[PDB]
Design a protein around this ligand. Structure first.
Ligand SMILES: *C(=N)N(CC(=O)N(C)Cc1ccccc1)NC(=O)OC(C)(C)C
Length: 215
C-alpha cells in the first residue's frame, strides 16, 4: 500500500458539510463513502443526500445517531440513493420521501474493517477509497482542534460517539496520520478536517467501526 494517499487530490471528496443540531454524522459519513466510490467509478463527484438516509434508514435513529453499515444496507435494499439536489438537507428528521427518479448512486452492500486493525483500514483506504469511520469525539482537545496530528490518551476507543470519513492517510513531520473529513462545517478544526494519530494503538477507536460501500 502507498505510504500517503489523499483522495481530495483525486477529486473523490465533496465540500465539508454542516449536520447542524441533528445527530446525523453517520449519514454524512455514509454519503462521504458513497461519494468516493461514485467518483472512482464514473468520474462524477456529486453531493448525495444524507437527508434521504436520516429519513429512510428505519434501522438507524435519524437525528439520534445510526450505523453506516445500516446506511449502506438501506441504499442496497432500496436500489439507490438521491442526490443532495433531489433530496436536500433540512438539518432535522422528516418522513421518508425517497424520489426514485432522482437516484444518483447504488450499493451492492458493504465490508467492515476488522475491529482495531489500523493496517487493514489503511489498505482499505489505499484500495477502495474514502472509508466511513467512527471515533470518540467527546474530548475538548478534539472539539477545539486547530492543527497537528491529534492525539489525546484520554480518548476512549470503546466509547464511539461520532461518525466521520478517512479520505486518506500520510505522515507530516514523521507523525503518521488519518486525513479525517468532519461534518461540522469548514469553521471547525482545519477547514472542516482533522489529522488523527495513525498507528498509535487505535487512537480514539479510529478502526473500531470502519466500513465502505460495495459499488
Ligand atoms: C453523530 N451525529 N452521532 C449521533 C450523536 O452524536 N448523538 C445524537 C449522540 C449519540 C451517540 C452515540 C450513540 C447514541 C447517541 N454519532 C453516532 O451516530 O455515533 C455512532 C458511534 C456512529 C453511533
Amino acid at each position: 500500500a502507498p505510504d500517503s494517499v489523499d483522495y481530495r487530490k483525486k477529486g473523490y471528496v465533496t465540500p465539508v458539510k454542516n449536520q447542524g443540531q441533528c445527530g446525523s454524522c453517520w449519514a454524512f459519513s455514509s454519503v462521504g463513502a458513497l461519494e468516493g466510490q461514485l467518483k472512482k467509478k464514473t468520474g462524477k463527484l456529486l453531493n448525495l443526500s444524507p437527508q434521504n438516509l436520516v429519513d429512510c434508514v428505519s434501522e438507524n435513529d435519524g437525528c439520534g445517531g445510526g450505523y453506516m453499515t445500516n446506511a449502506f444496507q438501506y441504499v442496497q435494499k432500496n436500489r439507490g440513493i438521491d442526490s443532495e439536489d433531489a433530496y436536500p438537507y433540512v438539518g432535522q428528521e422528516e418522513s421518508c420521501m425517497y424520489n426514485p427518479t432522482g437516484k444518483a448512486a447504488k450499493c451492492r452492500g458493504y465490508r467492515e474493517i476488522p475491529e482495531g486493525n489500523e493496517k487493514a483500514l489503511k489498505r482499505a483506504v489505499a484500495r477502495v477509497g474514502p472509508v466511513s469511520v467512527a471515533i470518540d469525539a467527546s474530548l475538548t482537545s478534539f472539539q477545539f482542534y486547530s492543527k497537528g496530528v491529534y492525539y489525546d490518551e484520554s480518548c476512549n476507543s470503546d466509547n464511539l460517539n461520532h461518525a466521520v470519513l478517512a479520505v486518506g492517510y500520510g505522515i507530516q513531520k514523521g507523525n503518521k496520520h488519518w486525513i479525517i473529513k468532519n461534518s461540522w462545517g469548514e469553521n471547525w478544526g482545519n477547514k472542516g478536517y482533522i489529522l488523527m494519530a495513525r498507528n498509535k494503538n487505535n487512537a480514539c477507536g479510529i478502526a473500531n467501526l470502519a466500513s465502505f460501500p460495495k459499488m
